[PDB]
Structure 1
Amino acid sequence: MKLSDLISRWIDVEPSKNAQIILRDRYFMKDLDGNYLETKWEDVARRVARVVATAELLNPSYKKNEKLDRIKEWEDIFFRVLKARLFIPNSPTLFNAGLGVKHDLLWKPIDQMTLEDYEEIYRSRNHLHMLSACFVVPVGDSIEEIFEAVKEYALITKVGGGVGSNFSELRPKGSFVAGTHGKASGPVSFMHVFNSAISVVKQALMGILNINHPDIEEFIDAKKEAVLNFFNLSVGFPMDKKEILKLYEEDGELELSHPRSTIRKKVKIRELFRKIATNAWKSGDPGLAFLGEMNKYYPLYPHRKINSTNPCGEIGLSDYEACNLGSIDVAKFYNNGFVDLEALQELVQIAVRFLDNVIDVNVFPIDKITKAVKESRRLGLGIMGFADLLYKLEIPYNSQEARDFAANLMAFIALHAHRTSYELGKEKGNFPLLEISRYRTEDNFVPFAMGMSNYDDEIREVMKMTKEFRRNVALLTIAPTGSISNIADTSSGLEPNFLLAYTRVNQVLREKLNPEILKRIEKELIEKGSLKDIPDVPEKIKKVFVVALDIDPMDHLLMQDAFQRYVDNNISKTINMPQSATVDDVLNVYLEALRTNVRGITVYRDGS
């Protein structure tokens, strides 16, 4: 089925009252008195498509005597996809698209748009016109660099970004400082300054410290349980997942050292892991960040290095790199018991172009960020509504069927996104750093593990094409989609529905479940939070309409690995554990985690 006919199925389904409240509440623009310039999703969709279509102004393939036709065609596609909610960019794009721009240019009908109007949009874009979710800055080992990083955190946070850092450059507590006053206070003491700064600016960050840092134990307890309430903390792992699994299995030792220090120490790699698991068992933090696995697949490694992710895990980024995200609602792609792959590939093509185009109309607070993005052009195309899609296809999330379905779905998406990048590379220019990347300097480089689809062969050959042309260094990610999935009235990222009914009722359950059976049980379901131990609901309804805590921790982890084989950046997935999980259940998640292809790990025990 053609995308245009898909769009027509969705373009006029009104956003729920839930979605509409969140929109009014924070997406609809407001004039200098707090009066509405936008009153429905259509206004947002028009504004956003028009701002992003403006980037086509820079397309060397067009000419004068063609640009305006071509530009308006892109705004029109962008607009229809957006209004239909089949693809939605990350929040910062929705908020900040068109800031600076004369109101009478942002909502004026497309037919009336002139080449001058598009140019004025382009140039009236102000310093707040920042449209990317994800940032990473370094924190060098000097008071100067620490405080410049604190400044950068403030500026990024002001304009709407989430920011992450690896703090491992900072010498541990006690090290010599060539001076007078004595000793380094260490990474963790400095993260408290970042926390204070952000707590003020925000009246949601990531901080990583590597496993072999002498202050790792202090760091692991850092949010126990002084505090760093604005940080998500992850333990970094710069070395092979292989080496770390093996060292653990052999009950090895890890040498804690730092180059700019004489602080050395030895700890049993298993005691450290138990320390992590115990804390995570209690409160969720710290997560794990398989930095070395990220770099394995990093087309620009080792002449660039991923040391951190963004606050939620899904983009591992090099220094001063940012990435703009967007998500395709796959639940809208259901048709007759099948995923309409005809329409999907067309959207994937449109979506990659939109995301590449956001780069050109984005404004960042820091020149080093502007330049890092220009050279790499990293994108984060993902999916939402996956769980809801599986409900429609009558596939239980915790099953091998579901994961083989995921892997193939993600493989398909990966294929056409990367083919779209080759084609944009042709049309617009390669990403400046193509020459020094492994897409070029290597043969048969692929930036994810694969090994769970029949598209591998095809993917392995699109990857050879991108030797000559490639617009972007990587293109895929699965994001949390906390807000935009709510806008799209769909499930979040790859996650299972956390609940089917929550007065604080899933639409697919409402259709597939016989009403009155639905009316009877809906009170009991709200309390018990699962269909599992509601008696007299059909075994097939019970099996398919699984919630997060119906799905055991390995089924969560194996879903993540399935998607991650076909994702070139990383994945936001929470490994939900039942309240009765033990610290030993967490270690087991961690070990399975080191054997699968996942690039990181977040666990969360119900009740903790």
Structure 2
Amino acid sequence: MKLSDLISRWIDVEPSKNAQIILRDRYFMKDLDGNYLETKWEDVARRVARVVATAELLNPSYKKNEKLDRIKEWEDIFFRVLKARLFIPNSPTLFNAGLGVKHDLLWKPIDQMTLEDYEEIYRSRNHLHMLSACFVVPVGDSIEEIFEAVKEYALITKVGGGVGSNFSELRPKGSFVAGTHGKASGPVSFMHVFNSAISVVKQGALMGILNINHPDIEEFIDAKKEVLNFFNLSVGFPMDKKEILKLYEEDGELELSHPRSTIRKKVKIRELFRKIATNAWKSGDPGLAFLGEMNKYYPLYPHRKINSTNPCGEIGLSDYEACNLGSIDVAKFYNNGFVDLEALQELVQIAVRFLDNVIDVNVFPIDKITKAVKESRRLGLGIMGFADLLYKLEIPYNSQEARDFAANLMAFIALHAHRTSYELGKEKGNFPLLEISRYRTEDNFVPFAMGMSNYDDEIREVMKMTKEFRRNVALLTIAPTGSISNIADTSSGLEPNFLLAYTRFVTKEKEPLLYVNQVLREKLNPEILKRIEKELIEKGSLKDIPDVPEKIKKVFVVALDIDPMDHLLMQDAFQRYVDNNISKTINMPQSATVDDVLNVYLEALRTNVRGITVYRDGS
């Protein structure tokens, strides 16, 4: 089926009372008086489509003759795709698109649009017109560079960004300093200033990484252990995953040392890992960031280096680069027991152009961010609605079937997204750094592991083509998507549903109202539903409810029906066809041990995953 027929299927399906609360609440634009300029998702779609279409002004392939015709084609498709809720860019695009523009222009009927109207749009985008979620910022080993970094954190937070850094350059606590009477405070201690800044720069989340071999890593691992309340913390592995696993298997020892200090220590890697596991078992921090693995697949490595992730870990970014993200609701592509690949391919092509066009209309806070982002044009196209898509197809999440489906779906998306970047690199010019990148200076470079799909050969084929024409250094990610999947009424990201039923009280002049997963309602006797429904919200799962068919219980699994390894292996299935990283919570039961956590980390080291986040139920 054609994307246009799928669009009609969906375009008039209105957001739920749920979604609408969130939209009114955070997304519908308001005038300076606090009054609504938007009162309907349709207004947001019009405004965002119009703004992103405007980047077509810069297309070197359009004669000025055509610009208005072709821009207005793009606003139309972008508009229809967004209103159908088939693809949603991420939150900042929806908040900040059109800020600075005359209000009479953002919602004008598209047939009343002049070229002058579009150029005026392009020119009146103010400094709040920031449309990326997150950035990476370096923090060098000097007072100057540390506090220049703190300033950049504050400046990025002001305009709504999240930020991450690797703090490993900072010389260990106690260390000699040539230019002071003080001993260096060390990374953990300075991170408090970073956390202070953010406690006072408000919006209406950070990533702090330290490397496994830093003299202060033990202090770091226990850092948030009663602050650093605004930090997520991860332990960085800049070396090969293979090498860490081998050291571990041998019960070996790691040398903790820093280039600009004489402080060193030897620790057993098993003991270090247990200390990480114990803390994660307790509080969920710190995660693991396999920076080596990210750099293994980084087209620009070692000209550029990936030292940190963004707060959610799903993009490894080099210094000053930005998260540029949006998501397709694959649950809307279910058609009679199959994924409509024809309609999905069109959307991929449109989505990659959409996200690539956000770069052109995006106002960044620092000049160095503009530069990093113009030079690589890294995109983050992902998916949401996959948990719900699986329910529809009657595939259990915790099954090899689901993982094979996942890898093929991802590989299909990868292929077309990367083909589209060829197309666009041809039509608009390549990303500035294509020449020094591995797509050029190398034979057979693929920016991910593959090896779980029949699309592999066609992908290597496209990767070869992109030696000549490539708009984007990387195209794919899987983000958490909490808010935009709520707007789209779908499951978040690649994550299983956390609950099938939960009670959400709508405050009035209070009065509880029940949600049951919509795909379940569609596939269970409302008969059976009415009785069990009460016990379901009590027990959180379908597992142990007596009179519910076997194969409703098998398919309608939630997060905690699914064991830690089944979580981890879904992550690996997607990671194999994603050129950035993956946001995946490895959920563990309350009854999980520290050893069970260790076993997840060991398996992580053998799979293709680029990071780990564990959350133990009840911790």
- CA deviation map 1:265-288 (0-9, x unaligned): 100000000000000000000000
Residues 93-124 of structure 1: CA deviation (Å, up to 9, x unaligned): 00000000000000001111000000000000
Which of 154-163 and 269-278 deviates more? 154-163
Residue 180 of structure 1, CA deviation: 3.9
Query: What whole-Å deviation, never above 9, does each CA across 1:13-67 have from its counterpart, x for those lacking one?
Result: 1100010000000100000110000001000000000000000000000011111
Offset from partner CA, 1:113-136 (integer Å, 9 cap, x none): 000000000000001100001200
Measure the CA separation in 1 of the matches of 2:303 and 2:74.
36
TM-score (norm 1): 0.99
| Alignment correspondent of 2:225 | 224
What's the offset of the Cα at 1:202? Answer: 1.8
Q: Is the 8 A contact 1:323 1:373 kept in 2?
A: no
1:567 & 1:375 partners in 2: Cα distance? 21
- The 3-state SS of whatever aligns with 2:278 is helix
Q: Give the superposition deviation at 1:390.
A: 0.1
Residues 80 and 206 from structure 1, CA distance in 2 versus in 1: closer, same or farther, beyond 3 angstroms? same
Within 2, Cα distance between the matches of 1:294 and 1:134?
18
How far has the Cα of 1:179 moved from its partner? 3.0
Q: Against the structure 1 CA distance between its residues 258 and 116, is the aligned structure 2 distance closer, same or farther, given a 3 Å change threshold?
A: same
* Partner residue, 1:591: 602
TM-score (norm 2): 0.98
* Whole-Å separation in 1 of the counterparts to 2:482 and 2:190: 30
Aligned to 1:478: 478
TM-superposed CA distance for 1:516, in Å, is 1.9
Q: Deviations over 1:224-278 (max 9, x none)?
A: 13x2110100000000000000000011111000001101110000000000000
Match of 1:539 among 531, 550, 554: 550
Deviations 1:281-338 (A, max 9, x none): 0000000000000000000000100000000011000001112100000000000000
1:182 Cα deviation after fit: 2.6
* Aligned counterparts of 1:446 and 1:23: Cα–Cα separation in 2: 39
Provide the C-alpha distance between the structure 2 equivalents of 1:605 and 1:390, rounded to a whole number of angstroms. 24
Deviation at 1:197, TM superposition (A): 0.6
Distance in 1, matches of 2:553 and 2:579, equals 34
CA deviations over 1:155-190 (Å, ceiling 9, x no partner):
111101110000011000011001342300000001
CA deviation profile, 1:195-216 (whole Å, cap 9, x unmatched): 1110111271100000000000
Distance 2:231 2:294 in 1: 21
SS at match of 2:323: strand
SS at 1:516 equivalent: helix
Rounded to whole Å, the distance in 1 between the matches of 2:257 and 2:303 is 24
SS at structure 2 position matched to 1:56: helix
Tell me if the contact between 1:326 and 1:381 (Cα under 8 Å) persists in the aligned partners: yes
**Structure 1 counterpart of 2:508:** none
Alpha-carbon distance, 1:382 to partner: 0.1
SS of the equivalent of 1:603 reads strand
Pairwise mapping of residues 280-299 of structure 1 onto structure 2 (< 5 A)? 280-299=280-299
Report whether the alignment pairs 1:575 with 2:576: no
User: Counterpart of 1:254 in 2: which secondary structure?
Assistant: strand
Match of 1:166 in 2: 166
Give the CA deviation at 1:445: 0.1
1:183 corresponds in structure 2 to: 183
State, as a whole percentage, how many aligned pairs show the same letter. Answer: 100
Please list every run of 5 or more consecutive structure 1 residues that lacks an aligned counterpart in the other structure: none
Asked whether the 8 Å contact 1:313–1:600 carries over to 2, the reply is: yes
Is 1:460 the counterpart of 2:471 in the alignment?
Answer: no
5+ residue gaps, structure 2: 505-515
Separation in structure 2 between the aligned mates of residue 557 and residue 481 of structure 1, nearest angstrom: 19
Find the aligned partners of 1:323 and 1:167 in 2 and give their Cα distance: 20
Alignment: residue pair count: 607
Residues 141-220 of structure 1 mapped to structure 2, 5 A cutoff: 141-202=141-202, 204-220=205-221
* SS of the residue 1:471 aligns to: coil
Find the aligned partners of 1:313 and 1:323 in 2 and give their Cα distance: 11
SS in 2 for 1:177: coil
- Decide whether the 8 Å contact of 1:557 with 1:575 is kept in 2: yes
Whether the aligned pair in 2 keeps the contact of 1:315 and 1:477 (CA below 8 Å) is: yes
RMSD (CA atoms): 0.6
Deviations 1:543-598 (A, max 9, x none): 00000000000000000000000000000000000000000000000000000000
Would the aligned equivalents of 1:300 and 1:436 in 2 still touch at CA under 8 Å? yes
Between 254-263 and 177-186, report the one with greater CA deviation: 177-186
Contact 1:105 1:121 in 2 (8 A): yes
Matched, 1:76 2:76: yes
Please give the alpha-carbon distance, in whole angstroms, between the structure 2 residues aligned to 1:513 and 1:183: 67
C-alpha distance in 2, partners of 1:508/1:35? 36
In 2, Cα distance between equivalents of 1:316 and 1:371:
17
